[model samples]
Target: RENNTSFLVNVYDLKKFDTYAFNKVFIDDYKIFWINKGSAKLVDKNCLVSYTITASSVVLLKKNSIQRFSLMSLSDESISVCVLTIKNKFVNSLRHYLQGDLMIRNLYNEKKDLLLWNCELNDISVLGEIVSTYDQTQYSEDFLKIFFSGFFSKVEKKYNSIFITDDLDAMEKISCLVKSDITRNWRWADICGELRTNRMILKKELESRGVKFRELINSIRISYSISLMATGEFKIKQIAYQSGFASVSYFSTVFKSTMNVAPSEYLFMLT
Candidate 1:
């Protein structure tokens, strides 16, 4: 209502309930928050939920959204980032009015509700400038309005280009579905059946994308395992099961093929 980029948060240096105000905190529209500087340890456990944040990462939080604000590590260092807020009232009006381009109703973004993605530093440079100017309270409503639409137009493009519909390929959808339940057995009949699609069609789509079904599944498992290990919480056997591998040895085999190192070695490097 009053400010554009005024909301800021100390993402690191948390003490559980002490910083729980950010817990289940709901905002109306997109809250574009990013790392202004320094690095914060990102983690996963509750299903590949985190990644190390650098300045280039941008997260678009939608309306009625709940980002638990869990970055894992707690310390004395201050990792502050400016969070830009937009009201739902304005967004709702703009949604219909700008339907031709904005297409705010696009289910593409609806699918990736949290919408955490990276942008080129050049793309983020303007965001930094806006944050600084807003911090000094030297902004105009006109500037904010222009920034609002133009910025979201960029976000919409990011979603579309990166996720170009599954009409042509089922790769992203497959990856998405698999990631949702990463620990499952992921049988072809189960996957295709649950997705309500024919395996033959899915097979051809994967061929067009030059990806084998097993290869994609293995890759997903590898990435999921990596995220689990990064949290420094799970042991190899535990990581293996949670990552959907039937055995620790099999997890090690896939880890080497995909990651080029043994799981324990990778864990050593992490520690």
Candidate 2:
């Protein structure tokens, strides 16, 4: 068992008729999500940051990050995601083994919580082959180790920039900060203070991103509401309050505009 890497993969199959409501929680294993079919969204509960996973896309979420799930939109097609969990020690060993590789190194770093890549057809087929071969080989460790090495090498080549960068621009930073407290009544001054910049600079930065500060916050709050509503356990009134909206009617207006469905209809989809 010297070569055993302590990795596990779970397949989550979603159908047009299937729905789920699992709350976000922390885990100790690094998670790799492969969107094999259709599309979905992952939202960080603590920060309210979200990601869209369309077909052929992969997202790697590190240990202890808060995560929640929601369907991108209702469709009459099958959707599936493969979640690969690797032990921290095993990943650390790979980091040492792949010493000069930035993607391997940054995976365990703090600057990036998630690594994303949109795979080509060949890359996606490689993953599928790996999964099938791994199962057929009776969970052989050496086989997995070889396949995983190839997987990382290909991923790094395709998404090296995202993996190697330590810098986050103003918009990304602002989105992270706002997600941290989507329920709070956020002000531009407060946001500027948290971002450690002056009002004019923050305004201009946001303007360059083609959004106003208030508009950004509102969008995030509405996005948060959508994730919460997917749980199917909260009333529209409760979701509105928890998501930082003052009035339920106003929340409904924004939700419908953004989601193209009423809050109640969205909840029904989960049932």
Candidate 3:
């Protein structure tokens, strides 16, 4: 519990399916967590944002800027769901909008315990409204463009902060490597070598953006898994192997731990 992160919860209404999904929407100042419908459990690194929402309880994630999080369904029916993401741009804009009444906090520097509302409002509907408004400005079709934009915005912000540090050159070198290999899956050590730095420096650079090297890598792998599951072509065992898991059992363990459910459950939901 020492490393446990705090999360905000919200439940949304989507009368389409009885399913649950674990998708990383954003990672900047903080990450947002959503449980579209049905009672579910949310699991995160060093913490479990566990909750049971029949139709009322909702989830909001305000945790460290790690891009990996997932949901597990207690029920077997399909559900309508979508994840919303906020980035440094949105957070900065919000701070400017708030006129400094509250400091724009980053997951790397924010207090472990904080609250957005002065009073406890039990209904998840308020948060639902926020999602709808954000969705309006989101990209066409997928509705997940905000996440990609948010991830970049955080990188930009971090770049500015470390511009004067010795790591600036290293960061630039790493950025170039990342861009060149943006579509390629990289091992941390290999990527660090490309940046002409070591693991420690690379880790430091990532920390500035409120993330670790491992978290970023695993997050991407999970995203790949989501795409795989959606296609109905890949089996859980196959995905585990392709995602670089040591074994099928280990993959399921991690899949359930990260996604809050087994791989088959997600695959079944697609049906």
Candidates by lDDT, descending order: 2, 1, 3
Question: Any runs in candidate 2 off by more than 4 Å, and if so which?
Answer: 1-153, 163-169, 179-181
Candidate 2: clashing pairs of residues: 47-179
Specify the poorest-scoring 10-residue window by lDDT in model 2: 19-28
Each model's backbone clash number: 0, 1, 16
Alpha-carbon local distance difference test for all models: 0.57, 0.61, 0.45
Put down candidate 2 lDDT per residue, 158-228, tens digits, no spaces. 54532322224565576567668877788867877877878676777555434556656666677578657
Cα-based RMSD of candidate 3: 10.4
Query: In candidate 1, what are the lDDT values of residues 1-271, reduced to their tens digit?
Result: 1223323321223232222212222233346667666655554222366676676887776543323345532334455555566544446544544444434455656545356777778767876765565443534434555665666656666555322111323554676678788888787887787777897778775554344667667766776786677666677999999989999988888777654567897677556
| Candidate 3 lDDT tens digits, 112-134 | 31112111243355545444543
Q: Candidate 3, which segments miss by more than 4 Å at Cα? A: 1-30, 34-83, 87-89, 95-98, 101-124, 129-185, 194-196, 203-216, 227-257, 267-271
Model 3, residue 62: displacement in angstroms?
5.5
Question: Candidate 1: how many backbone clashes?
Answer: 0
